[PDB]
Amino acid sequence: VIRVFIASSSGFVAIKKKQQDVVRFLEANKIEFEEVDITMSEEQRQWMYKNIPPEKKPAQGNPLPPQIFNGDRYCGDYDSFFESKESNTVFSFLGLKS
Amino acid sequence: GITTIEAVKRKIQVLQQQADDAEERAERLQREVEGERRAREQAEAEVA
Amino acid sequence: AGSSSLEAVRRKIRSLQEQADAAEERAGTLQRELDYERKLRETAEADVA
Amino acid sequence: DDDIAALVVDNGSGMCKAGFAGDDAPRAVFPSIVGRPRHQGVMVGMGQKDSYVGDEAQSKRGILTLKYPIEHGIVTNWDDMEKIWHHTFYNELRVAPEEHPVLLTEAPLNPKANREKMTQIMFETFNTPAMYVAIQAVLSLYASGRTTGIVMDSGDGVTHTVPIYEGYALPHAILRLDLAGRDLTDYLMKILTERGYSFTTTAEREIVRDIKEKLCYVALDFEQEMATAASSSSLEKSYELPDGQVITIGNERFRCPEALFQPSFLGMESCGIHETTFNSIMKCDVDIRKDLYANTVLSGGTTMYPGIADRMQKEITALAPSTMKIKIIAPPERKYSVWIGGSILASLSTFQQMWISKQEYDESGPSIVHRKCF
Amino acid sequence: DDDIAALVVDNGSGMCKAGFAGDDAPRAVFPSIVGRPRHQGVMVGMGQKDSYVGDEAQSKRGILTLKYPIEHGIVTNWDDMEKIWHHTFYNELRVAPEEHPVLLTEAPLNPKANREKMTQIMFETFNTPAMYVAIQAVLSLYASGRTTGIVMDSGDGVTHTVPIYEGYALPHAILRLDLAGRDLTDYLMKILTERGYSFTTTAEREIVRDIKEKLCYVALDFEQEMATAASSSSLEKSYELPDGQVITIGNERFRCPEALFQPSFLGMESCGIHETTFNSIMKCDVDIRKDLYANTVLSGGTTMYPGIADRMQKEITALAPSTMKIKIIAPPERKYSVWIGGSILASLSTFQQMWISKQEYDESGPSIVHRKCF
Amino acid sequence: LMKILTERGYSFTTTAEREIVRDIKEKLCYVALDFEQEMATAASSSSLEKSYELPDGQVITIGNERFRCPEALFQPSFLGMESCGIHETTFNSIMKCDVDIRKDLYANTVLSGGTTMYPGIADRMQKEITALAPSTMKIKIIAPPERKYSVWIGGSILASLSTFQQMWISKQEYDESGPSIVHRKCF
Amino acid sequence: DEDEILGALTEEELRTLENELDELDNALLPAGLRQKDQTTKAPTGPFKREELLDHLEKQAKEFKDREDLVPYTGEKRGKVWVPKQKPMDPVLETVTLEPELEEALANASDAELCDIAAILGMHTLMSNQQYYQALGSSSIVNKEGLNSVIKPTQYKPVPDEEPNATDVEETLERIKNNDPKLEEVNLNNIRNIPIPTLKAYAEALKENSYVKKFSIVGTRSNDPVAFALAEMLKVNKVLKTLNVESNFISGAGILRLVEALPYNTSLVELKIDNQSQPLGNKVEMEIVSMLEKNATLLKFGYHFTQQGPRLRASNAMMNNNDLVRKRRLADLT
Amino acid sequence: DNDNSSARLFERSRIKALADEREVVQKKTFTKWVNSHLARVSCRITDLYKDLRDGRMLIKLLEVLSGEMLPKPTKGKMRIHCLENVDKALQFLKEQRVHLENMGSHDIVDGNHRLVLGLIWTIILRFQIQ
Numbered sequence A: 001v002i003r004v005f006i007a008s009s010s011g012f013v014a015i016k017k018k019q020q021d022v023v024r025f026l027e028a029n030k031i032e033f034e035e036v037d038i039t040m041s042e043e044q045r046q047w048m049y050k051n052i053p054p055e056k057k058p059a060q061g062n063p064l065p066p067q068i069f070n071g072d073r074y075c076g077d078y079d080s081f082f083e084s085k086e087s088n089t090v091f092s093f094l095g096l097k098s
Numbered sequence B: 001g002i003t004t005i006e007a008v009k010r011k012i013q014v015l016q017q018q019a020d021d022a023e024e025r026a027e028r029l030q031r032e033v034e035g036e037r038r039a040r041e042q043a044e045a046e047v048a
Numbered sequence C: 001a002g003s004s005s006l007e008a009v010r011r012k013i014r015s016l017q018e019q020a021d022a023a024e025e026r027a028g029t030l031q032r033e034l035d036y037e038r039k040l041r042e043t044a045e046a047d048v049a
Numbered sequence D, E: 001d002d003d004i005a006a007l008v009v010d011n012g013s014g015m016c017k018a019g020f021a022g023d024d025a026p027r028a029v030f031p032s033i034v035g036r037p038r039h040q041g042v043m044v045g046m047g048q049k050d051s052y053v054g055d056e057a058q059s060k061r062g063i064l065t066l067k068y069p070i071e072h073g074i075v076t077n078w079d080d081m082e083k084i085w086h087h088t089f090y091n092e093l094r095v096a097p098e099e100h101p102v103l104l105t106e107a108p109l110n111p112k113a114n115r116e117k118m119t120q121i122m123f124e125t126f127n128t129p130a131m132y133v134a135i136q137a138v139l140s141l142y143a144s145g146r147t148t149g150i151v152m153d154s155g156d157g158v159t160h161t162v163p164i165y166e167g168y169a170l171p172h173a174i175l176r177l178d179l180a181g182r183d184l185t186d187y188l189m190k191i192l193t194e195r196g197y198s199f200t201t202t203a204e205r206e207i208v209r210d211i212k213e214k215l216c217y218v219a220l221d222f223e224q225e226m227a228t229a230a231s232s233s234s235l236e237k238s239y240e241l242p243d244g245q246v247i248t249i250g251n252e253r254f255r256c257p258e259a260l261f262q263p264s265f266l267g268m269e270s271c272g273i274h275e276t277t278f279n280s281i282m283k284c285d286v287d288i289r290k291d292l293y294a295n296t297v298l299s300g301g302t303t304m305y306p307g308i309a310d311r312m313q314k315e316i317t318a319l320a321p322s323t324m325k326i327k328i329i330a331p332p333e334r335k336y337s338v339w340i341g342g343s344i345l346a347s348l349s350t351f352q353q354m355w356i357s358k359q360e361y362d363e364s365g366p367s368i369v370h371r372k373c374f
Numbered sequence F: 001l002m003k004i005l006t007e008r009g010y011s012f013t014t015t016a017e018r019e020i021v022r023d024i025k026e027k028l029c030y031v032a033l034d035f036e037q038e039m040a041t042a043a044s045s046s047s048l049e050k051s052y053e054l055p056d057g058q059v060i061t062i063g064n065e066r067f068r069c070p071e072a073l074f075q076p077s078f079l080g081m082e083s084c085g086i087h088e089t090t091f092n093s094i095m096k097c098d099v100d101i102r103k104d105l106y107a108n109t110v111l112s113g114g115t116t117m118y119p120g121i122a123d124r125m126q127k128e129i130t131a132l133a134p135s136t137m138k139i140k141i142i143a144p145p146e147r148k149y150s151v152w153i154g155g156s157i158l159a160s161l162s163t164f165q166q167m168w169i170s171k172q173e174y175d176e177s178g179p180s181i182v183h184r185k186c187f
Numbered sequence G: 001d002e003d004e005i006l007g008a009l010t011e012e013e014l015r016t017l018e019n020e021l022d023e024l025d026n027a028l029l030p031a032g033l034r035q036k037d038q039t040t041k042a043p044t045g046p047f048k049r050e051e052l053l054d055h056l057e058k059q060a061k062e063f064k065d066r067e068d069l070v071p072y073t074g075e076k077r078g079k080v081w082v083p084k085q086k087p088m089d090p091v092l093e094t095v096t097l098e099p100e101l102e103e104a105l106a107n108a109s110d111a112e113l114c115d116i117a118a119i120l121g122m123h124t125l126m127s128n129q130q131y132y133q134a135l136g137s138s139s140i141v142n143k144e145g146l147n148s149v150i151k152p153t154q155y156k157p158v159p160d161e162e163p164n165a166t167d168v169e170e171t172l173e174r175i176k177n178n179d180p181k182l183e184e185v186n187l188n189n190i191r192n193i194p195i196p197t198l199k200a201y202a203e204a205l206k207e208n209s210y211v212k213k214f215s216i217v218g219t220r221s222n223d224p225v226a227f228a229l230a231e232m233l234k235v236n237k238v239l240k241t242l243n244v245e246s247n248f249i250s251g252a253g254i255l256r257l258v259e260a261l262p263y264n265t266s267l268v269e270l271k272i273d274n275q276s277q278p279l280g281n282k283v284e285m286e287i288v289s290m291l292e293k294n295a296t297l298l299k300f301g302y303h304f305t306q307q308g309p310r311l312r313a314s315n316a317m318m319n320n321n322d323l324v325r326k327r328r329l330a331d332l333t
Numbered sequence H: 001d002n003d004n005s006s007a008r009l010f011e012r013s014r015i016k017a018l019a020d021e022r023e024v025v026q027k028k029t030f031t032k033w034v035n036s037h038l039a040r041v042s043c044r045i046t047d048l049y050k051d052l053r054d055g056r057m058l059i060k061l062l063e064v065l066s067g068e069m070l071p072k073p074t075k076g077k078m079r080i081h082c083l084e085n086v087d088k089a090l091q092f093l094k095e096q097r098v099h100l101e102n103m104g105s106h107d108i109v110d111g112n113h114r115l116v117l118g119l120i121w122t123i124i125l126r127f128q129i130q
């Protein structure tokens, strides 16, 4: 099951735009997903920092909210999603076969 | 062509004539209103 | 936006139509004001009698 | 029947505070916000419930649209008030309102139907044996402990000034100005846009209000503070958003409350609070002004910004004659003063004569509130 | 004789226009896109001079990635701005920036760094002698020939409504909604994927944008349109692809612009554009509302949907009081009218006082744009 | 009227809205002959209400506030003033005069100014003055229909008189005796 | 020179201008039909996407290369601003008040330092809540520190509510059977209820004399459901409360609902709050004007934007409740 | 409300008539004066309210009356250029000591009879032919 991490309330427009793009892509391709809010629950927000690997973090501050997980497999951020959208390798990127 | 020349002339004449006839109607209606105001006020002074 | 002369001709046509419409509306409101003034005539003359 | 203790309920624009009579502090304090489902999709967390009331609505901001039942001290949505009152009586104080008297508060200059509808709703839907409607700024003077002075109240919906001399209020000198915390919050959103941050929805409104309650202060000198803030980054402070990123407000922390002293920032042509208080003093007689200068009392949650007292004293001292002596009384517990004096007012022995009985309501309809109350 | 006047550069969110002052039409029209080689180093580093700009970028859609340097009216990447600006100055206009003043446009409520960075780029890179920054909506009101009205401007990144009465702007009633044509493009892709035509990358973005421009329309009644589209196929049209394959749009022609009026389709908690105009009118004074009802002006490329004006007139008349009249001015050339406004405003004789010359910039820096402009 | 229109929920605060309130007062205010009876009538039925149209198309209903605003002319305690009403002021100004000239003053009361253009002011003034005055004297209130311009009209009379050419403060007199000359010539 | 300007334009453009002036767009035609078709070719194929991608790729490959007149090098051709520096204030004075009080505050932690910082009057330095709890009592309470960043309120978690377990078909079947032991029907927040199913409920409640309250909150209901409910309300005499909040009902549908109120005297509470679009002031005026006609309804939940209709609706509700009070009083005595 | 009706009656009649006759004869005299002064150049005014709206007539009148050169009028059919043309003449009047109250360029542009008549009267009274 795909879990996307979404900040419902945010002061930056680009974050909401990226989250809505990911939601639209999962919505259109008939792909079942979980809708998880980091602002509404502290536990999942703390777990989301905890799962992601250190070799690709933001240097200053907490990582950006839009993240994709497959169960507890970690798929990636919005950057890898956009790169796989360009390279037509999105299904491999989420880990869903074919 | 030539038909375009009389078409341009026809459209210009139609627009200018519509503007002009609207102008006389409004203008001689303004004359009419002014005459009405004159006679009304003086008859109404007779009332007073 | 194809050319400047096209917009100049278009603005001439637009100005002619717009001015004619404005004159039409002004004539209409002057007409109903005239009717009101005439009603004032008739009432005043009856009161005079 | 000394076991029957009345309930003191203050219905502010932002927060509702309820408690028992004869107590120093209110038992329940919670915002008056009604949350309703969004239209983007179905919610995750609730089933048969139609709406959320109180802190439950405040916690679930991401799936709800938030509405305020009080707009500028006026009850626009009466069913929302019934929901708020039901939550207050059944979920916070855990008492049946049938057995207790109720005391309520009101802004000075209101539509006359407000008191009538409030009395009718209370008597019909809660079956209280007795009730009373009082005015907030008299309760503030009760809480302060003196019987002479001018009360300048600024809540979340309205600002009002009233003078009192020896317990006689002057109704012709009462001034009401529409400037409160909500307009300051909207201006804070408008002045947080040019730094890059954007806030649109109602959850963003609550976030901005939380920022304002903790970061804003009133500058003593506006031009000198502006030059100081342009000179260096000493005044800058950082805030943590719920998403995780950190913002830095910087200059505009003292620009938000400056609208209370210069309303032209909001585009309105009214005067500031200092000019309003001075005009309210000038509307009184010549003789009593000397007392009213000495007993200026601040109240309301909006006057909780630091540095407001010295600034207001400086402005009024500029306006007033040099001979006169001016001091500003700012109690440290003033945010709840409107409640506190109510707890005094229900404790007095004379006030038992002033209740509105169920029988008197039964003969006289909801119009008994005008004859029985001020 | 002032070096054939200034240059008007309307750098929109999705497409840029440039030309000389005093001309009715812009000389250069081309999209604001930067195309880069996608991932490969094949064919002797094919994709040389890696930055492809404008028409040449959309020529090689298959082998490149197209990036928009302007998103939501805000410059994400500044090098791409100065590359686009270099292309405008040298590759198409073919005029030196040293002797020609430059006029620039921007969104109303933008972060303050954009003005300073544009001033720094104009004065430090292209060393222009004078420069000014204006607002697109004021330029639209200039192009309409009226000095009183409310202006909507909706480009590819931003929608904003401003009221102006007698040449006086009301800053408190200016609104900014972040719902533009890019969101409509994304929604069109979302509803096309359900039909069976999946469009993903930037070449697909250009194709879907072309489909939307050529085949969309605003339905007068949405439920009647749904019943008509379900009952028959007369509303269906056909679009051929560049290779030769032909697809049918059908039900997707009118669902795409309806998200302008109902943002619940897009997944956004916001009101429609008609509600934005009505709320901007209600935020003005009592008396000047009527003229704002009679001088509603539309602008921008988004408003070239067929039937948008009549539908929005119906919505406004549904909201407005029935006593006065509502009319909507929708010029057929409105997509360019913002630029035309510049061609008027740089042509005025009194505007020569308002130029920001290089001598003042060399003493004040990039902050002078806060004092000189607006 | 602004402060009493606040009671119905309508809000007017700016200086531009004061002109709107003034227009409402000029169009829809009248002086009730009896105040308590009018309050009872307005409370019992809604036949006294009137509707006004705002400049932005809103429709408001005045109702009971039509005659409460002019009633403040006769009871100044509504504004917090402790002064007396206009009828009491007129009676006190009559009573300060000598005994002989009162009989002519009771029958020659003249109203003037725009504020005395409320419909029904003359009957109320006559009734109150007749209540104050002794019974054997008769009260006549003179209210010309064009009284709003009376202060102008008499002035237009006064400059046309023959002897008023001997009244003017000349330029030479002001040059000779400074700006304080106006007390010697003008009353 | 109008004739010269028109001659400067193309003659084909002149004929097109004459044709366009004769056509004047397509105001007569409807919104859908006024657009022109792109091509005349019939639709063919199931849209094989890879052919599109490959065609676009080779189209990009076999393109003649535009060569720009001037290459870009990122050259800065203007004077750098070089912001000015200030001499600032180089002052240095030691206060040295007390050897005792030097060492007392020399080793104090920052958290306890902020208390004496706030009590002396540096309100600008720390947050306001911190500043006030510093002045609250005569002890060190401040734990955070002046330098530290401020964090938002967390409030309290709310437990998840069980999803709606009310099935659709059995409930409708029991409603159609006039079940004596079914009084409350709850349809709040149910996924994907068909519109004809909701209409079937609407005619099902016409003949049901045992259900007292109804609710379809958050069902994405639309105008036909509103019309069917408005038809149902005239027949029914038992339904007490109807709840249609949080829906997609337009203004005309709500007008149809309020137009059914004079005919029936059994409904006491109606809630129409939180609709997708505002109803408009004309609909509000009609609602309040002919809701003044009805005398049975007691509770009405709607937030009026205007002030006049809101005041009149509040007065009407007051009158209805006062009628209830008066008839109770008359029954007593 | 017979007395209020009579007050509105007097207001509607006598003030309006007494102002209208003065305004008519004043504008008829002013048209003759401006036509006599504008006849030196190839110009003529047929309507006082409409010919002075656009602004070229006024700037040419100031040209001939001052005898001294004025800046180029801006060329354009829209309202903004008309505002510019009126504003330049108003500024030229502002230089040579003539004092004006309630004068805006949009007042002349919109066509208020009182203000254009007052402007022409001020030109006759205070300005110097020289």
Ligand SMILES: Nc1ncnc2c1ncn2[C@@H]1O[C@H](COP(=O)(O)OP(=O)(O)O)[C@@H](O)[C@H]1O
Pocket: D011, D012, D013, D014, D015, D016, D154, D155, D156, D157, D181, D182, D209, D212, D213, D214, D300, D301, D302, D304, D305, D335, G128, G129
């Ligand atoms: N610590 C604080 N500092 C500054 N402002 C505050 C603080 N706490 C609350 N406020 C302001 O006070 C408002 C609440 O005031 P409140 O006392 O509820 O008014 P009311 O008189 O209507 O009850 C909030 O909207 C907020 O803006």
Ligand SMILES: Nc1ncnc2c1ncn2[C@@H]1O[C@H](COP(=O)(O)OP(=O)(O)O)[C@@H](O)[C@H]1O
Pocket: E011, E012, E013, E014, E015, E016, E154, E155, E156, E157, E181, E182, E209, E212, E213, E214, E216, E300, E301, E302, E303, E304, E305, E335
């Ligand atoms: N003929 C058309 N019909 C419908 N929509 C159009 C048409 N032409 C352009 N558009 C829309 O207008 C947008 C372009 O707006 P534009 O004027 O470039 O914005 P900006 O103000 O940023 O320049 C496109 O996204 C497209 O959806």
